[PDB]
Amino acid sequence: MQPYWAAIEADIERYLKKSITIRPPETVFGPMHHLTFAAPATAASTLCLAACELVGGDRSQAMAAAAAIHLVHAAAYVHEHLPLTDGSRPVSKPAIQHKYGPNVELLTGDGIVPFGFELLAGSVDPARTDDPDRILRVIIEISRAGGPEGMISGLHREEEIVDGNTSLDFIEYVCKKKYGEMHACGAACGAILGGAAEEEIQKLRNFGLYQGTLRGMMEMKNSHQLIDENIIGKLKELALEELGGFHGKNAELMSSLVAEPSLYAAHHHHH
Amino acid sequence: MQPYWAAIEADIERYLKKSITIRPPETVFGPMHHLTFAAPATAASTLCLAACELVGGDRSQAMAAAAAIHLVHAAAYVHEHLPLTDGSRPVSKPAIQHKYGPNVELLTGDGIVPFGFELLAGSVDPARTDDPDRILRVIIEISRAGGPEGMISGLHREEEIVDGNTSLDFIEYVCKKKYGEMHACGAACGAILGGAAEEEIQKLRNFGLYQGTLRGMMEMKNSHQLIDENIIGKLKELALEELGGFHGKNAELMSSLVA
Amino acid sequence: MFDFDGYMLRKAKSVNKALEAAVQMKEPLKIHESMRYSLLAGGKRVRPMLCIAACELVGGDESTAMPAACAVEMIHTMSLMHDDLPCMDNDDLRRGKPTNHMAFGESVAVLAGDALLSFAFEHVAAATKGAPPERIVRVLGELAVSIGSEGLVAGQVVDVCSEGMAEVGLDHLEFIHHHKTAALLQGSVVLGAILGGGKEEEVAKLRKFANCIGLLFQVVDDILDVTKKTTYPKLIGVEKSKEFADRLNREAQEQLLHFHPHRAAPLIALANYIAYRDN
Amino acid sequence: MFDFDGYMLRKAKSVNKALEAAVQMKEPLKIHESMRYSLLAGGKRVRPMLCIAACELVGGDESTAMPAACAVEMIHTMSLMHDDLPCMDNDDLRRGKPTNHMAFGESVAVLAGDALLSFAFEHVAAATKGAPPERIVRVLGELAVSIGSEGLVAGQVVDVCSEGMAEVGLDHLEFIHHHKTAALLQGSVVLGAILGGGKEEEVAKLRKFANCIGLLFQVVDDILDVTTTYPKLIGVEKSKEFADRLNREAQEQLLHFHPHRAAPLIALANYIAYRDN
């Protein structure tokens, strides 16, 4: 990935590591620490820091929200990979490694989500006027996006997907719900925390939506080969369009997420 | 009350008949007419007229909208009982009788729905200045209620119901989509065409939404003997709760629809 | 005009982008999936083009017409979805892909089609901007007449209630084509023309133009079949069919004579393309 | 006199009405059906009642407490759905009917559980009217802490990762029972007290009271199971007595307040002490 985005990501990693200090009882915080970092990195989290600085803010104010977003996603990740006994869900061809048993996994996920709200709630700065309102609003966004009409609808509909037999339209919808809403939530939240106004918030949200959707598509093109560059072109266009109107240094970076910048390393390979 | 409701169905029937004339070519109009009337009446159309009067308007001002609602309902009724040849829709317990074959029924359903909108667009009286906005508005309401996130959703989800094995929560939901959305539409349109203000429209809209869900909840009562009055009751309460504010026969002439 | 293909392509492209945005996948998913499967499958998008062309013809702009353009294509799409069904044509393919009911079952295909029909009125009704309410209602009225018992559907019924006889005269065959084809093309041009702000005299011209090109299509299709089950060649032979076709084309263009030539150019070329295509 | 039985029916009646309204059926239908199947399955609504009583006790009203009151019932509900799973207690029945996963499959029970947990935060955050934003935020943080790894969840995990011990003293069994249940009960009282505009000292008093009934609820639970926990260690001939002490000290904290206002909480305390189901 690009230099800017790996560094934001590392910031979030260091913040999460500082907030989740493995202490007694270790059968509790050990699994909580391991699973937070065992989950894949999500741009919905970095997109939060990014959009905040993009609208004037200091990524630092968007930090609690970025951590919470990663945390809501990590709990979801763990639950999705839970070994289930009744075979109520296709055991996703892609099985992952499991350091701890199901009971510990289930439970920790259950403990990870509230933790994201704890960091948020507790990040309120008294010497800040609108803090309680933005933080309140961000908590509504995150809990909606991690909720039944959000991430959960995507996880649920994901189970009906059948190996190269499901349409691109259906998969795009599953990715929009599973990834899109969280990315949208992340851009939206960082805008909010960064002081933005409503029109920007609505465009960064729309951007997040398209980008997240596009990213989920990329992550499934390795499980259902068919990803016509038409879909990608589609989401890519939709995203950049939303981005229009943010001119600047930082704005340059944002658009990079969606569309990679011209690099010699990518031409040197193919040559 | 029975006569007031009765004259309403009659007024709508006499209007449909004055509007759908069997004529050349009989192969088209013969089944259009037969199917417009072989389809049971729906209270959604009744509720539309009663709501227009409720707010002060003349019954004729809502007559086209009520015929439209009947036609959309009629078209859906026809399409839902089509003999499919691939087992994709379980056949209705009381498999209805078909006079014309599947192809004529399919096409005719496609011909009747637009007939509704033709009636509405055609009912604009150029001498009445508020007509275009209200008709337009009502065309949006009906097409939405009969669309994919309204009735078609209920119709679609209904095929998931396994007799004596689906929860009341799920069944009520199907009725809300399949019948509630349309009754909500009929009352909302009726209030709109009568000149009602936003608050009364919303109230009547919500009443119809609850009332139609209850009503459809009753049709199904045969398939699943579990007519738990608690759900039946919960609905009436939410409903009558919406009539409160309108006080008078209002919270009354309407309740007759819950008897 | 120069580059009629280029003009058809840009127009199909705007339409495709607008169709995609109008009908998103959403709950319930099989219903919307099925809608999209047939709506976004490609196609020449002739009806949407006729609609936009007519609007522009009389000074309007594409954006005002776009919802209606999409609407007529929605109708067209659902008529084909219902048409491929086992009780109808019973086709298994369409563009080298399974027909709609082969993919989602007959039940969904019926409903998904009823949803496109419904949504067409909804979209025009709610999304049309830059035209007064009496004008939107009036085009909702036109759309309705062009697809009902005196239009699209009349054409389909009469055709299914006639594939079992032979005494099909010129008059009967014209009813089927005027209704199963021309009707919706007249819908398209009238919708555009009204939204564009056209006078009744202009709407009527465009009305004849459409009626001529729609009949022109079926006639040239018949000619071509014979070249490389009542048809025009069986009823009046290929020679007179070609003469009928030149006359249809000549009459369509006559209708466009008073509009600005540059704005008429697309429609005229469309007429010639219909009259002389090799396939 | 204080008619505790009538008071509860009315609170429960009011709470059930708000839960049914807050979780409607909508797409995806199965996820919402599952949420509703366990949320509205009937139950005593002790947590939502503790919440509402604490808010009322300090000066506020029901309406302000209701969203949080439903939120703690939602987390309580997902907690049981998750605990009933095969990888946990593996229960087939609960409240007289088949457990959630039995009715819907494990995937849905897990998902629907996660939905109730998220939506509990959405609800309090967005539907709480009658308290400024920073008060609400604070309530969310209090709820987070009480159900987190320093709370309900912590208790549960220290309980499963020691489901084959033998040296369980009165400090190991104090933690589990102070967390795997006490925590959410405790948190219910706090949200209410803060939402009603309680002053710090009042919130401090109710938190302590909260602690006692919290443990009391746990202890009393172990007694209803058997008729490794308190029963085992000191045996009912002091286990039923321990509960008696807790209730007392619980009610002793309530002395901070006018006896007329505290009657409901004194009542809910006794009911937590002398309940049969």
Ligand SMILES: C=C(C)CCOP(=O)(O)OP(=O)(O)O
């Ligand atoms: C003549 C009728 C009634 C339908 C087919 O027309 P088209 O040949 O325009 O097909 P498409 O390109 O739109 O797919």
Ligand SMILES: C=C(C)CCOP(=O)(O)OP(=O)(O)O
């Ligand atoms: C979390 C634990 C250990 C027990 C449940 O408490 P309840 O006894 O309050 O259960 P319900 O009444 O809600 O059904």
